[PDB]
Amino acid sequence: SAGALESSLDRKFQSVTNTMESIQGLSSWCIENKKHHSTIVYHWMKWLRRSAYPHRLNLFYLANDVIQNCKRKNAIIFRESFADVLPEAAALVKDPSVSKSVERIFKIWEDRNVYPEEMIVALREALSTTF
Amino acid sequence: SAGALESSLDRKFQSVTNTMESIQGLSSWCIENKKHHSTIVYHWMKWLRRSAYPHRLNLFYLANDVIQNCKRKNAIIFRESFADVLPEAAALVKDPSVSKSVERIFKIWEDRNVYPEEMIVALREALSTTF
Ligand SMILES: [Pr+3]
Ligand SMILES: [Pr+3]
Ligand SMILES: [Pr+3]
Numbered sequence: 001s002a003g004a005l006e007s008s009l010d011r012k013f014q015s016v017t018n019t020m021e022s023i024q025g026l027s028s029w030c031i032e033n034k035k036h037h038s039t040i041v042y043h044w045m046k047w048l049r050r051s052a053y054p055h056r057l058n059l060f061y062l063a064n065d066v067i068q069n070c071k072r073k074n075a076i077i078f079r080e081s082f083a084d085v086l087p088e089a090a091a092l093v094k095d096p097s098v099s100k101s102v103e104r105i106f107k108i109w110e111d112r113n114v115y116p117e118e119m120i121v122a123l124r125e126a127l128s129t130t131f
Numbered sequence: 132s133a134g135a136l137e138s139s140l141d142r143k144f145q146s147v148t149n150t151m152e153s154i155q156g157l158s159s160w161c162i163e164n165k166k167h168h169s170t171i172v173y174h175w176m177k178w179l180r181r182s183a184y185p186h187r188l189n190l191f192y193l194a195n196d197v198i199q200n201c202k203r204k205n206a207i208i209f210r211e212s213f214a215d216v217l218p219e220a221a222a223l224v225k226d227p228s229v230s231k232s233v234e235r236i237f238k239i240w241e242d243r244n245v246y247p248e249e250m251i252v253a254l255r256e257a258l259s260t261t262f
C-alpha cells in the first residue's frame with residue numbers, strides 16, 4: 001500500500017504537464033484515491049520542493065483542479081489536506097515566471113470562498129503579490 | 132473594428148490548444164474585450180462548427196474558462212452570451228472521443244449553479260450523456 005502508492009505518486013507527480021488532459025486525468029485519480037488524501041498531499045509537496053519553477057506551476061495546476069473539483073466529487077477533505085502545505089508552497093512559486101498564474105488561482109479561490117479570506121491573504125503575502 | 136476584431140478572433144480561435152497557458156491567455160483576452168461579447172461568441176461558434184472533434188474540445192475548454200472566470204472579472208455578460216450557442220454546440224461534441232470531457236464541464240456548471248438546472252438538462256440531452 002504505502003510502497004505501491006508512493007511508486008504511483010512519484011511517477012504521476014514527476015510527469016504532470018500543462019495540458020487539460022494531463023491535469024484532469026491526475027486530478028481524477030487523486031479524487032478516486034481520496035482515502036489516501038494525506039499521503040497524496042505529502043508526496044505532492046515533496047515533488048513541489050524538489051522541482052524547478054515550470055514544473056512547480058504544473059503541480060499548482062493539479063492542486064487547483066483537485067481543490068476545485070473535490071467538492072462535487074464528495075472528496076472535500078482535499079481542501080483541508082492541501083491547506084497544510086499551501087503557505088509553504090506559495091513561497092516556492094514567487095518567481096515572476098510563474099507567480100501571476102498562481103496569484104490567479106488564489107483569486108479564483110477567494111472569489112468563490114473556497115478558502116477563507118485570512119488564509120488567502122496569508123498565501124498572497126507568501127507569493128509577494130500582496131504586501 | 133468589425134474587420135480588426137474578426138481577424139484577431141480567427142487567428143486566436145484557429146490556434147487555441149489544450150494547454151493551461153493557451154486557454155488562459157485567450158480567456159483573458161476575451162474578458163478584456165467584453166464590449167464585443169456578442170461578436171466573440173458568434174466567431175467562437177463559427178469555429179466550433181467548422182472544426183473537427185479535437186479542436187472542438189479545445190474551444191469548449193476556452194468557453195468553460197471564460198464562463199467560469201467572467202464573473203470575478205466583472206464580465207458576467209459572457210454567461211448569457213454563451214447560452215445563445217450552447218445547446219447547438221453541445222450536439223457537435225457528442226462523439227465519445229470528447230463528450231466525457233464536455234459532460235464534466237456541464238457537471239461543474241451544474242454543481243455551482245453557473246447555469247440553471249433546466250438549461251444543463253437540455254445540454255446533457257444534446258450531448259447524449261443523459262436520455
Ligand atoms: Pr521516498
Ligand atoms: Pr520512489
Ligand atoms: Pr468571415
Ligand SMILES: [Pr+3]
Nearest residue numbers: 137138141142
Ligand atoms: Pr477571416
